[PDB]
Amino acid sequence: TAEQSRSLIVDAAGRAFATRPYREITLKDIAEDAGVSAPLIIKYFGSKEQLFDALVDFRAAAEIVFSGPLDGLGERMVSMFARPLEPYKPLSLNILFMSGPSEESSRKLRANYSAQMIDALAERLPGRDARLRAELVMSMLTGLAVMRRKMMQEHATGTPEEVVAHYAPLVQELLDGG
Amino acid sequence: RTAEQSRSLIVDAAGRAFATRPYREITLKDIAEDAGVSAPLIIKYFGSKEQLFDALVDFRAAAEIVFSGPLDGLGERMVSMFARPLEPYKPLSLNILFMSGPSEESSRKLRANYSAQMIDALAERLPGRDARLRAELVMSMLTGLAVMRRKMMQEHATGTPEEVVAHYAPLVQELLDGG
Ligand SMILES: [Mg+2]
Numbered sequence: 001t002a003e004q005s006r007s008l009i010v011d012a013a014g015r016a017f018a019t020r021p022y023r024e025i026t027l028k029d030i031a032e033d034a035g036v037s038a039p040l041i042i043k044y045f046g047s048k049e050q051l052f053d054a055l056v057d058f059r060a061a062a063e064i065v066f067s068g069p070l071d072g073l074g075e076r077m078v079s080m081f082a083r084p085l086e087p088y089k090p091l092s093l094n095i096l097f098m099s100g101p102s103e104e105s106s107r108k109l110r111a112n113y114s115a116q117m118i119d120a121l122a123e124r125l126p127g128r129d130a131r132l133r134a135e136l137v138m139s140m141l142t143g144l145a146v147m148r149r150k151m152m153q154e155h156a157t158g159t160p161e162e163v164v165a166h167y168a169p170l171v172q173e174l175l176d177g178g
Numbered sequence: 179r180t181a182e183q184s185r186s187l188i189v190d191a192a193g194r195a196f197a198t199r200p201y202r203e204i205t206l207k208d209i210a211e212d213a214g215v216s217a218p219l220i221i222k223y224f225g226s227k228e229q230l231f232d233a234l235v236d237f238r239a240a241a242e243i244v245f246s247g248p249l250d251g252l253g254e255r256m257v258s259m260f261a262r263p264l265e266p267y268k269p270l271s272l273n274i275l276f277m278s279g280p281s282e283e284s285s286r287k288l289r290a291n292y293s294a295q296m297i298d299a300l301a302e303r304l305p306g307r308d309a310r311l312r313a314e315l316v317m318s319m320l321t322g323l324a325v326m327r328r329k330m331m332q333e334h335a336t337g338t339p340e341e342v343v344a345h346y347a348p349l350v351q352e353l354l355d356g357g
């Protein structure tokens with residue numbers, strides 16, 4: 001029912017917002033990609049703007065990325081960001097890149113990312129400069145995914161475990177503090 | 179002023195345009211308007227829109243700047259450059275890439291150039307095993323930092339550049355030294 005359709009819609013909307021300029025996207029485009037009709041996107045989400053708001057609520061992402069103890073969190077996060085996924089993931093940064101002169105959509109995304117992603121990590125870190133360190137962790141993780149998935153693509157060297165071996169201890173140093 | 183200074187204005191305006199709007203939505207007229215020069219002047223110095231684009235995505239000068247000097251202390255020097263609070267569309271490498279899309283010719287040439295001129299150029303310098311991977315990870319860290327601070331965070335980026343160096347440069351230096 002809603003479950004299978006909504007997931008198809010969210011999936012299509014994320015792709016759309018992460019790959020095309022905000023100002024170009026219609027609900028009809030999203031519906032066509034989702035294999036649904038536009039009216040039931042309006043039923044479940046109300047408007048394009050509200051659909052966008054759902055896609056820039058980062059609370060679920062933070063629940064996935066920061067799950068579990070700080071011990072070994074570096075390696076768990078790098079594993080996830082080292083997976084060779086689509087060039088438009090993570091959605092956070094890719095939707096941001098597609099904003100352009102859509103200033104309100106960019107503003108909402110950035111405010112939510114700071115509160116729901118960065119601060120969610122910063123709250124958990126021991127020691128001094130927790131906020132700065134959380135920004136640096138997300139710099140490393142998002143920078144890795146964008147570099148590998150978008151800039152390098154097939155040119156990317158090394159397997160995910162090799163990425164983890166080199167990069168996770170560095171992420172873990174930021175998590176641990178000092 | 180001089181030819182050299184007209185060229186500087188054009189390159190500045192062209193980089194901004196290509197890093198902020200889709201390739202297809204960019205005209206030499208608009209670049210000229212932003213630069214404060216005439217479009218025929220852009221043609222004199224660069225030949226065409228495509229050739230201007232090719233100049234922008236030639237990363238050899240960027241590599242000379244970013245990888246200059248001994249490997250000793252290079253991490254700190256590199257984090258110092260990428261920690262500066264520059265425009266949200268810099269670095270041009272990534273921002274112009276974001277404006278390209280579905281492995282268009284523009285995108286293919288940009289990526290090939292970045293791989294050879296940036297990644298491989300750094301990798302050739304590194305001691306120890308897995309040099310290409312380590313160069314990719316260094317650039318991941320540096321570009322990730324600048325995009326996060328300049329584009330995502332903006333006014334709410336935390337810390338001065340020296341504070342960023344203190345935490346981040348030793349990590350960059352570990353990858354340079356051996357991984
Ligand atoms: Mg993210």
Ligand SMILES: [Mg+2]
Nearest residue numbers: 269271272321
């Ligand atoms: Mg770069």
Ligand SMILES: [Mg+2]
Nearest residue numbers: 302303304305
């Ligand atoms: Mg070597």
